[PDB]
């Protein structure tokens, strides 16, 4: 029934029923006065763009341009959109990004696990991040000191050879050749077999 | 829809392999360990007091 979240070092776990984001925003807007609360200047600049049109002003109820306060509806919609950025309801994803990320990380991480309880479940893998991440950080640092950057060295990350005409995440199985050459982690993985 | 124990068994596979001699050191044979075995889930304890 309850949900417990205790990420803080010095604070006990919070106790809420469901929909933690919406519950937190509603409780903080209801139990205490939210008029004095002002968000960052980024939200203030977004407020000008939202106010400049009548339909958007009606939708978001943003009446005062100079006021630094942000209404509950705008924040809730922004949070919902940010959550929706990854998952698309059009097609059912087989597995979440965390599953594939854990697989790709633990494919390297298998060597140390043989000295400990072999994990047959994801939860045991999740329970060993503090003991596993330092190895990944060390090898990432070593690769950073090792790469010569045969690809364009403007930035060192993934998904850089995307075709300018293509503007969709899903393949149109088919992969354009050389799409992921610029990533350095895939280079390290291929080097390691 | 759920899979049988056989398919997840075959997928999970084995990862260890050890060689053990008999008491007299007459014969040597290997043992296999399956990661999906119920033996792992039981969490039994072990000791060898002298």
């Amino acid at each position: 029934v309850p949900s417990y979240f205790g990420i803080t070092q010095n604070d006990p776990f919070i106790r809420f029923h469901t929909d933690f984001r919406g519950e937190v925003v509603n409780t903080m807007f209801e139990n205490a006065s939210t008029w004095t609360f002002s968000f960052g200047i980024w939200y203030y600049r977004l407020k000008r763009g939202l106010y400049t049109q009548p339909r958007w002003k009606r939708v978001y109820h943003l009446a005062q341009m100079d006021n630094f306060s942000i209404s509950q509806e705008l924040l809730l919609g922004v949070v919902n959109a940010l959550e929706n950025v990854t998952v698309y309801p059009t097609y059912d994803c087989v597995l979440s990004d965390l599953e594939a990320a854990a697989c790709l990380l633990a494919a390297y991480g298998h060597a140390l696990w043989e000295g400990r309880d072999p994990p047959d479940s994801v939860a045991t893998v999740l329970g060993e991040l503090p003991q596993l991440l330092p190895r990944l950080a060390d090898d990432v640092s070593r690769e950073i000191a090792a790469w010569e950057g045969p690809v364009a060295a403007g930035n060192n990350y993934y998904a850089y050879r995307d075709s300018p005409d293509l503007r969709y995440y899903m393949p149109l199985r088919h992969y354009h050749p050389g799409t992921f050459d610029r990533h350095v982690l895939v280079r390290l993985f291929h080097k390691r077999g | 829809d759920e899979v049988a124990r056989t398919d997840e068994w075959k997928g999970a596979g084995v990862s260890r392999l050890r060689e053990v001699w008999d008491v007299q050191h007459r014969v040597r044979l290997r043992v296999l360990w399956y990661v999906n075995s119920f033996w792992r889930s039981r969490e039994l304890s072990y000791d060898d007091h002298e």
Binding site: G115, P118 | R18, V20, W21, Q24, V27, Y46
Partner: peptide, 27 residues
């Protein structure tokens, strides 16, 4: 123990500490 049709047999003994020397030590 291994048994063959003619009744002959051969056998030998193990110590559990040798079989489980490291697999159980992890758990």
């Amino acid at each position: 123990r291994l048994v063959w049709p003619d009744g002959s047999y051969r056998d030998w003994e193990f110590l559990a500490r040798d079989l489980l020397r490291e697999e159980m030590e992890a758990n």
